[PDB]
Design a protein. Structure first.
Lengths: 47, 20
């Protein structure tokens, strides 16, 4: 009767979203620098 | 056939499957 063990091993199949979802998704969109996607043309330099 | 009907139908309709 594996139809249960094989049908139960699937429990982790979708749970794969729950984990990534967790509470605050372990990632409150930190961004850090996503807005200004223009990271300048490597022309940094400064004085 | 077993847990399938008794795993996703109970939280909604205690039906089997074909009848959803």
């Amino acid at each position: 009767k594996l139809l249960i063990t094989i049908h139960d091993r699937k429990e982790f199949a979708k749970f794969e979203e729950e984990r990534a979802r967790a509470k605050w998704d372990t990632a409150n969109n930190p961004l850090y620098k996503e807005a200004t996607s223009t990271f300048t043309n490597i022309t940094y330099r400064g004085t | 056939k077993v847990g399938f009907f008794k795993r996703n139908r109970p939280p909604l309709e205690e039906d089997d499957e074909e009848g959803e």
